Amino acid sequence: GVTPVAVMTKPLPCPGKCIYCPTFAATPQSYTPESPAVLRAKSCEYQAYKQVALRLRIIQDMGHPTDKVELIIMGGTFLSADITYQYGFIKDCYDALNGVVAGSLEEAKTINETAQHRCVGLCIETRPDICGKAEIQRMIDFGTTRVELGVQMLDDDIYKLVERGHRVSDVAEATCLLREYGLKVHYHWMPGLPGSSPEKDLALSRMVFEDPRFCPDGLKLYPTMVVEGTILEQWWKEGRYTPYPNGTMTGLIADIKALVPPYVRISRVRCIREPTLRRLDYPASGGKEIFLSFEDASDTLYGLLRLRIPCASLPVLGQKYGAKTGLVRALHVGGRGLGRKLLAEAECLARDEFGLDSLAILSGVGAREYYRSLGYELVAGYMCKHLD
Amino acid sequence: GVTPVAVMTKPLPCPGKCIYCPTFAATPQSYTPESPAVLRAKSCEYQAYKQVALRLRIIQDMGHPTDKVELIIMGGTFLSADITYQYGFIKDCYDALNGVVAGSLEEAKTINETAQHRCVGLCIETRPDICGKAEIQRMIDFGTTRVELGVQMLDDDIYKLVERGHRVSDVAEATCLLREYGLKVHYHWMPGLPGSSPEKDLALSRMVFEDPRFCPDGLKLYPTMVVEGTILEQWWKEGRYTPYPNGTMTGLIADIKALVPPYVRISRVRCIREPTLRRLDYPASGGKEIFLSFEDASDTLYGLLRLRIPCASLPVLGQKYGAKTGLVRALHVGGRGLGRKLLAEAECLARDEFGLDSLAILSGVGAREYYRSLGYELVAGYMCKHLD
Ligand SMILES: CCNC(=O)CCNC(=O)[C@H](O)C(C)(C)COP(=O)(O)OP(=O)(O)OC[C@H]1O[C@@H](n2cnc3c(N)ncnc32)[C@H](O)[C@@H]1OP(=O)(O)O
Ligand SMILES: CCNC(=O)CCNC(=O)[C@H](O)C(C)(C)COP(=O)(O)OP(=O)(O)OC[C@H]1O[C@@H](n2cnc3c(N)ncnc32)[C@H](O)[C@@H]1OP(=O)(O)O
Ligand code: FES
């Protein structure tokens, strides 16, 4: 029951230095120019406060709730701009949610912990090669809870729809780091990219879900299509690219959804979307991932929890919570008890089965109060508990 | 007294996968379209045999000698094409020099060891990121003796005149490998690139000659200028780039030439171009470089020898020449005795001062016979001697 508030960043230059590169970097929304959010963003001159305020007005006019919100920074190039711009943009978002201006970002965050519109999640689109330790540290300062990597398709010989492009190595290194810091990892997935087949697309889709370097929490399926007035259109006119027949495409995405394991949230534009407690383990980036969930005999999902046994404790946790610290990466229950039941199970598994010294939860600022009522305390952006 | 025979490779696609990239990769000759060799290359449909044959006819018509030749493969993208194309292109070159067709590349090489037109050197333009162990191994099969890296300018934030561009890391890794295999290393150098200053250009030029990761054997100075009908021209029209004033440029290249150490061959488009034996040492890519030379009281250069004490013996030398092997990377004497005198000194320094087990010389095929007359024997493309 979380409402998404998606805003765009201002057009930025290409992160890489190249005279062949375009003036402005390529965004995932370059081939979706008619999305309401994109159209609104342009109308507001890409102002953070103006966008969030306007989007709250639309949601309220529709009669939808706004007490639980997930901010979504769209662009994929956000983390490569001026540091002043990044923090300023985020600070604007929280101010709009709070309805009051603060003196700094951290003040706005702490204010949102108890405001009408809780920011229980904050997602940031970024690219595989723009997602290192430096970039991740900033996302913690923003209160980030989820990341969408512009993977698009998993092969270094398939043309990506952005400038330069990335390597598979960059995807694995970013995915590993994101997990070691307690973040959600979602991949942008778009079959039909130049230099690929319906076979290769589906092949790579099976690999990513049975390859420990990857195995994301969800996919955002972007069916590739020739939007007019774009580079890809030039290739269509020139016969250098031919889209998958409409019937073919609808068939391919269907096969993709079937491959997906149970722990994966398929997003679009078997999958996620009395009950008993279910458990599912799988390796990922060296460590172990534990997918807890509440489901009934009909296999309908009621709530989930993502517990990770990490390889290392990269977080800069306090002196008491030293080494041997586990990470609760997610906890969604779309409201009577399932929450604490799931969190209680994860605590024991970390103490009894893996002998971990404590747990840490990279929660959203608007959800911190929830974990406070269960014995957790804020430490360097994380909600922690000694766990005995 | 070596005659250069410069030929171009066929237009190739961009090594990297990018929809923004151009149709054909960018070459160093894209901003020098009026060079005789470029104009001839287009006229011959970029055929290797046709180019080399025609160039031999021109040189003979001018009355210049052709008994000593250096082949120069121009393009910078050669090593990224079909392996069949690469070996075929090289094999064509040797056939034209020999005046006779052979059954394979190796047969053409061995034939050129004794032909009228000796191929005493073979240079290949390549890019910093297209110069790994795999790429270098092929260049040995071709009989390569020198490499020109498209460094252009040494900063990851300066726009290069090719697509994608490279990092400084790629330049250091390529330079290290090239040295460990006994090759000459020359850098393409062009001040005036978008996003730079006459100050930054000269600053970086001082660094490269006092930084162990670099210190090339020579620079090929490409004064940047706005050739009509090019990307850079678009930037000039759009005021996004302004060239260095003509007077400024001539001044900057002058300051560059003064910085240069004594071991460096400044090429254009203190520097190189009775006598006693001179010695000069300097670190480079972990190992040690020894620059021997014959010069007189007036400091006029008569001949040089480049001896390297490598960190490791990456070459795949025979069983007798095991570890502890030195590399003679160059030996030029622009003809009574200086040659063997220089080579004798290097042999002793390798045996007495550095206790090396043997020496190896990555000579050109047309020069192998020279080293045979001094006790060296061919082994995996190198001319080797046990050295006792
Ligand atoms: C990736 C993590 N994302 C989030 O936590 C934000 C989305 N939140 C949710 O999906 C679910 O509300 C939760 C994960 C918080 C679990 O809530 P659920 O009701 O299913 O289980 P619980 O047994 O813990 O009951 C929730 C209690 O905390 C309250 N609560 C719900 N959300 C919040 C919140 N963000 N902050 C503080 N309190 C909350 C509820 O009001 C309730 O208390 P109440 O009955 O007195 O009103
Ligand atoms: C990077 C290395 N590049 C090369 O070796 C190719 C360019 N060659 C040169 O610059 C010079 O000719 C050399 C490096 C070979 C040194 O020659 P230099 O005459 O100065 O010293 P030397 O005392 O060794 O005398 C050279 C002898 O070898 C002969 N010679 C010269 N070049 C070659 C050659 N490529 N192959 C076989 N023999 C040669 C000469 O004819 C002479 O013998 P000769 O007097 O009976 O005719
Ligand atoms: S155009 Fe900048 S990398 Fe292809």
Author numbering:
A (entry chain A), B (entry chain A): 10 to 278, 311 to 314, 330 to 390, 394 to 447
What does the paper say about this structure?
To obtain detailed structural insights into acetyl-CoA coordination, we combined the respective blocking loop deletion (DmcElp3390–406(GSGSG)) with additional active site mutations (e.g. E386A, H388A, R411T) for co-crystallization trials in the presence of acetyl-CoA and different acetyl-CoA analogues. We successfully co-crystallized DmcElp3390–406(GSGSG)/E386A in complex with desulfo-CoA (DmcElp3-DCA) using similar crystallization conditions as for apo DmcElp3. The overall structure of DmcElp3-DCA closely matches the structure of DmcElp3, indicating that ligand binding has very little or no influence on the structural arrangement of the two domains or the Fe–S cluster mediated rSAM dimerization. DCA is structurally similar to acetyl-CoA but lacks both, the acetyl group as well as the thiol-moiety, and therefore represents a post-cleavage product analogue. DCA binds to the KAT domain of DmcElp3 in a similar way as acetyl-CoA is coordinated by the active site of GCN5 from Tetrahymena. In detail, the two phosphate groups of DCA are in close proximity to the glycine residues residing at the start of the blocking loop. The rest of DCA, including pantothenic acid and β-mercaptoethylamine, are pointing deeper into the predicted binding pocket. Furthermore, previously identified conserved residues, including K77, K193, and Y441, are involved in ligand binding and in close proximity to DCA. The β-mercaptoethylamine part of DCA was not clearly resolved in our densities, presumably because this part of the ligand is flexible in the absence of the missing tRNA substrate. Considering the observation that DCA stays bound even in the absence of the transferable acetyl group, we conclude that the cleavage products stay associated with the KAT domain until the next round of modification is initiated.
Elp3 acts as the catalytic subunit, but the loss of any of the six subunits results in hypo-modified U34 tRNAs in yeast, indicating that the complete integrity of the complex is important for its function. The enzymatically active Elp3 subunit of Elongator contains two functional domains, utilizes multiple cofactors, and conducts a unique uridine base modification specifically found only at the wobble base position of tRNAs. The two domains form a cleft that contains several highly conserved basic residues, which bind and accommodate the tRNA anticodon stem loop (ASL). The current model of a radical based Elp3-mediated cm5-modification reaction is proposed as follows (i) Elp3 recruits SAM and cleaves it to generate a 5’deoxyadenosine radical (5’-dA) in the rSAM domain, (ii) Elp3 hydrolyzes acetyl-CoA in the KAT domain and (iii) an acetyl radical is formed by the products of the two domains and (iv) is transferred onto the C5 position of U34 in the bound tRNA molecule.
